[PDB]
Design an enzyme around this catalytic site. Structure first.
Site, PDB file in Angstrom:
ATOM      1  N   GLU A   1       0.843  -1.168   0.000  1.00  0.00           N
ATOM      2  CA  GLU A   1       0.000   0.000   0.000  1.00  0.00           C
ATOM      3  C   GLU A   1       0.890   1.234   0.000  1.00  0.00           C
ATOM      4  O   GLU A   1       2.032   1.185   0.488  1.00  0.00           O
ATOM      5  CB  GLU A   1      -0.915   0.014   1.216  1.00  0.00           C
ATOM      6  CG  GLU A   1      -1.818  -1.212   1.352  1.00  0.00           C
ATOM      7  CD  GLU A   1      -2.706  -1.471   0.140  1.00  0.00           C
ATOM      8  OE1 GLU A   1      -3.212  -0.500  -0.448  1.00  0.00           O
ATOM      9  OE2 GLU A   1      -2.909  -2.643  -0.229  1.00  0.00           O
TER      10      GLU A   1
ATOM     11  N   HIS B   1      -7.865  -3.816   0.071  1.00  0.00           N
ATOM     12  CA  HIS B   1      -6.876  -2.750   0.198  1.00  0.00           C
ATOM     13  C   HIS B   1      -6.217  -2.673   1.588  1.00  0.00           C
ATOM     14  O   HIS B   1      -6.029  -1.599   2.145  1.00  0.00           O
ATOM     15  CB  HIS B   1      -7.506  -1.418  -0.224  1.00  0.00           C
ATOM     16  CG  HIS B   1      -8.085  -1.433  -1.612  1.00  0.00           C
ATOM     17  ND1 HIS B   1      -7.306  -1.397  -2.756  1.00  0.00           N
ATOM     18  CD2 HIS B   1      -9.372  -1.456  -2.035  1.00  0.00           C
ATOM     19  CE1 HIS B   1      -8.089  -1.414  -3.821  1.00  0.00           C
ATOM     20  NE2 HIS B   1      -9.348  -1.449  -3.412  1.00  0.00           N
TER      21      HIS B   1
END
Ligand SMILES: [Mg+2]
Ligand SMILES: [Mg+2]
Lengths: 227, 225
Positions: free
Chosen positions: A16, A187
DNA sequence: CGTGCTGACGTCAGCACGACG
DNA sequence: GTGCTGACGTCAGCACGACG
């Protein structure tokens, strides 16, 4: 026949970050999941329609870290990841430093060689970014001698087992197409790593073959950006 | 007082090994799950009967490694863990070596101090065994400067929220608080997560207790020599 | 023989926008 | 900018069997 031979370890990778490639982004969270070749070959081939989501192998090495960036996240990125520079810094997370490189080196030196990294859209995103973050440092690359491949190309190749519309190869689209469920913990570095693992376990034998054919050295990946 | 300050990081820990203390066992699997103080305090408050299993914090550093021992697992140990020396070695897993120490050192260094380990039954099992494995190595202890506690003691303490002879095994405590079975039983990571859930029941009370009872890992005596 | 059809392949200009966070 | 796609030029393969 096979440049570099049969890969003994796959390391599934996902990052990320603060934003997208235009933005000269920085890494906010990293996850590694290292699976030995056998472990993946021994995945069960029991497939009806739909086939069940494969269960991860017993034997796995895993590393999950949160990293403080040197700049803020875009509102967009901070929404979807659930992370922010403010929060990482009140929680005492460090920058991407030499110490983190020493960690990654030691993790990789526990995996038998040769050794290939595997990341969804990794040619365009995760591998250049990582390469940039690592060039900045005083140490020598932990990833020298390591190979890498992109799972989009792998799964595109593999969906030559059947011709309707042109279909998406986003992580989620693939998972749902193959297993007919929504994936989970979206995510978050580790969550998407586990989704990725699941799609690679769909046809293990065929994947390894393809990884063996297309593996290339990480040292050839060019940095997203410089300084 | 508070002998070493407020702990800024809790590292939840769990081992699997080749057997039990009378064998001179060796570590086969190791999981560390590092959670910052604030991340624990920001856990949503338990209410209702039972309360739901808390959801882990977003921000967590996690390490899980399988490790090849130098001797066979017992038949009992292999059954319950799902691991065996044969399988670890065909998959190329390494020994508990100088390189693994370096790894653990680097993982720990990424955590803000002061820093306390938390293991279920750690005072009797995990901490001594870990101490043993580390003393064999040519390096200094990665855990110099790190503190430790036992979660069995903390959870005994915390269950004088009621006013009373219960079991304080990991599964008994979970089932007692949440009225469910815990899931990935006897996999290093599974039971670490189960431990974290336990510790997230009354996050404030726990941190208070850990601060009062944390002691240096250097003072733990090896299992065997 | 040549001629001229066909299918396979490599190239390139034009077009719709993926897919990472 | 990337990454599909269809159009185009090229080339190897193949079918003719014509006549005195
Ligand atoms: Mg991804
Ligand atoms: Mg235990």
């Amino acid at each position: 026949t096979l440049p570099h031979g049969h890969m003994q370890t796959l390391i599934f990778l996902n990052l990320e970050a603060t934003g997208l490639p235009s933005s000269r982004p920085e890494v906010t969270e990293l996850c590694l999941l290292a699976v030995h070749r056998r472990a993946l070959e021994n995945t069960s081939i029991s497939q009806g329609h739909p086939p069940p989501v494969p269960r991860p192998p017993r034997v796995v090495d895993k590393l999950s870290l949160c990293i403080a960036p040197g700049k803020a996240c875009s509102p967009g990125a901070s929404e979807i990841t659930g992370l922010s520079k403010a929060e990482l810094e009140v929680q005492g997370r460090q920058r991407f430093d030499d110490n983190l490189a020493i960690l990654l080196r030691a993790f990789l030196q526990r995996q038998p060689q040769p050794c290939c990294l595997v990341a969804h859209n990794g040619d365009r995103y995760d591998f250049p970014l990582l390469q940039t973050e690592l060039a900045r440092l005083s140490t020598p690359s932990p990833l020298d001698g390591t190979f890498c491949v992109d799972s989009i190309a792998a799964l595109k190749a593999l969906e030559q087992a059947s011709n309707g519309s042109r279909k998406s190869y986003s992580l989620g689209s693939i998972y749902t197409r193959l297993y007919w469920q929504a994936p989970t913990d979206s995510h978050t570095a580790e969550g998407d790593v586990l989704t990725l693992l699941s799609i690679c376990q769909w046809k293990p034998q065929a994947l390894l073959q393809w990884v063996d054919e297309h593996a290339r050295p990480f040292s050839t990946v060019k940095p997203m950006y410089g300084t």
